[PDB]
Each structure stands twice: as structure tokens, then as C-alpha cells.
Symmetry: C2
Subunit: 200 residues, 2 copies
């Protein structure tokens, strides 16, 4: 029931969550919650809603539902459907003329230009702490940006009914030492763009 | 009195705190606490103790003393003298073979190499958020580093100066705030200011 409903929601993001199978295997609630949350976080990167600055979680409820949270606040219930979920996210969003998010991924603060020479962006990747670029138009009608939070570099390539959920972006991550390598950044952009083109 | 004692402590850092004068004007306790705290923060930049990552405050006590706080915890009282203050700070410090601090100013996290090329440092100043470099060698036996926390860029030039209780000017920190903190051409100018000032003290 509700597990299959979650899987259906995830499928709109191209996320093969397999929650129905996990529940069928008699997983405990903790294992399910962790899986629900990991899947929802992946889906947020795919849907292009522009809410990277919020923490996204999902959890089983006593009444056989799945609660969807942002920053720890109950925001929606899976049983209520796509329209209800889109309505919940809508007031949190800020979209530009292209359908791209106007929020920084890191929250309030400085964002670098999105069209820097690679020679300069390399310095940020290698030597900054957390940082972020604004969107820029890239190859093949796409748009791209990057941010680092802690030891994960997030490389986003995007190409944008209100209740409709679909793949609008792909986020490729580089973690640990990989998060500080500018040539691996170039590779991740190619990966994300190629994946996005496949979905669209 | 205790206000003159604090001024004496501040003088070892080349800080003309004028607390005795503020007290003489019968400023309120909150005003004194703010002035004491601002002065202590300036002194910390001059003494070269390497405690930029800690919050430094100074406040009147109810029994006529001035308490020095580090991260909110009482560390020493001004009435207890230089020896007690140095003993309080010593276990917080981590100094290299040169007498330069081994702590990052920003705390745990990535620090760029000290000898990062100037042109690349400029990119950090213009386009990063918080960032920090390790020490590099400068002219005349000095060493320098730079970091930005929020909207303040800090440029430190140091030349370690002696008894453990001794306080003296070992460094100078020039700051740039607001839009000035993101102007890459400011770095060389601030470096020159700090180096020139340090030379005058020593």
C-alpha cells in the first residue's frame, strides 16, 4: 500500500527506491525510515524544486502513512498524493524566469559567478571551504551550478501542471578527497548532463 | 586601581585602552564591559598567542576585579597578574618551533597552503566564503597568514619575540570589513600596513 505509493512517487524522479520490497523483507522501521529518507534526498536532486538548503526526511507513521518533512517540520503525507505534496513545497520555492531556483544551496551568503574561467573555479574547488556558484547556461540547453558543503561537492545540471513531478535536474556528487579536484569536477558536469539528457 | 591595571595589561599589546579614563567618567558597567572586551580582542591580535578560534571577553566582577573569559569560561582575573594570565592561556596554545601558532583561526577544516600564489589567493578573496591560509615567510624574519570569517578579512603579520609570563607585541592584525573584505587588491595593502606596524613595535 503506502510503500508502493512511495515507490511510485520516487519513480517520477527516476529513483528506484524498492521500498515495497524492503518492507516485504520484514525490515524494521529504522531501516525503512533510513531508506525512505535516502530516496527522498535523491529525488529532491532530480525534481529540481530548488530546496537544497532544507533537510529532507521521510518517516513511517503510526497510522500506516509516510510523513515527508522539511527542516524537521511535517510538510506532507504520501497518502495525500502529488497535488498535496506540490502544494506543500510551493511556498518554500523561489523560481526564476527559466524555472530555476533562486535560492542558494548553502543558504544566505556569497555566490560566485556561474561563468568563471575554469582556472579560477579550480582555486575554489581546491582551496575554499564551503562555496557555491550561481547558475549559468551551459551546453545543450542546460544550466549548471556547483556547491560544496563539508566534504561533499554537489554538481547540478538542470533543464526545466503545478502538481506534475518529473526529472528536471541531475546532481552528481564527489565526496572526500574527490570533492577538491577540479578535473573531477569537469567530469562530474559531463556525467550529470549525460544522465539528464537520458531522462528527458 | 583595577582599571589602570587593565590599561597596564593592554599596554603590553600596544593597545591604548583608556579604561581608567572611561571609569573616571563614571561610565556604566555595560559600557565598561564592552570597552574591556573590545580592547582584549585587539590585544589578542598583538600578543600572538594564537587563540583566534576562541571568544575573548573581559568583564567587571561583583567584587571589584576584572575577569578574563575564554569561550565563556573564566580564565583569570586581572588582579592576579601577568603570570596567572599566561598560565591560563598556556594549555590552550599550540606553538611551532618558530613560536607561531599551529591552530587554524577558523577552527577545524581546510586551510590553503601558506605559499599559495597571490593570484590564487585573490580568487579566494573575491569568490569564496570563509577561507584561511597557513603561515608563509615574509620580509625581515616575519611570517604572514590571512583568513576571512563572515564579513571580516584578517591579515596577520607575526614575528615571535623570554619568560613565559612575558606579554609583548609579537604580531599585528589588520582587518577589512564589509565590501572591503572581498576586495582582492586590499590584501597587499593590508599586509604592508601590518608589517610596517609590527616593525615599529619591535
Amino acid at each position: 500500500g503506502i510503500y508502493a505509493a512511495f515507490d511510485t512517487l520516487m519513480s517520477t524522479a527516476g529513483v528506484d527506491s524498492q521500498i515495497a520490497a524492503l518492507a516485504a523483507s520484514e525490515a524494521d522501521a529504522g531501516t525503512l525510515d533510513a531508506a525512505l529518507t535516502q530516496s527522498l534526498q535523491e529525488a529532491q536532486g532530480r525534481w529540481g524544486l530548488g530546496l537544497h538548503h532544507l533537510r529532507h526526511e521521510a518517516r513511517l507513521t503510526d497510522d500506516g502513512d509516510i510523513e515527508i518533512l522539511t527542516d524537521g517540520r511535517p510538510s506532507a503525507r504520501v497518502s495525500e498524493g502529488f497535488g498535496a505534496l506540490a502544494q506543500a513545497y510551493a511556498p518554500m520555492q523561489a523560481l526564476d524566469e527559466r524555472g530555476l531556483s533562486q535560492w542558494a544551496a548553502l543558504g544566505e551568503g556569497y555566490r560566485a559567478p556561474g561563468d568563471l574561467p575554469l582556472a579560477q573555479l579550480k582555486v575554489l574547488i581546491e582551496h575554499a571551504r564551503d562555496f557555491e556558484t550561481d547558475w549559468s547556461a551551459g551546453r545543450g540547453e542546460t544550466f549548471q551550478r556547483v556547491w560544496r558543503k563539508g566534504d561533499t561537492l554537489f554538481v547540478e545540471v538542470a533543464r526545466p501542471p503545478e502538481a506534475h513531478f518529473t526529472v528536471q535536474a541531475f546532481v552528481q556528487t564527489l565526496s572526500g578527497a574527490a570533492a577538491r579536484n577540479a578535473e573531477e569536477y569537469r567530469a562530474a558536469l559531463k556525467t550529470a548532463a549525460a544522465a539528464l539528457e537520458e531522462y528527458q
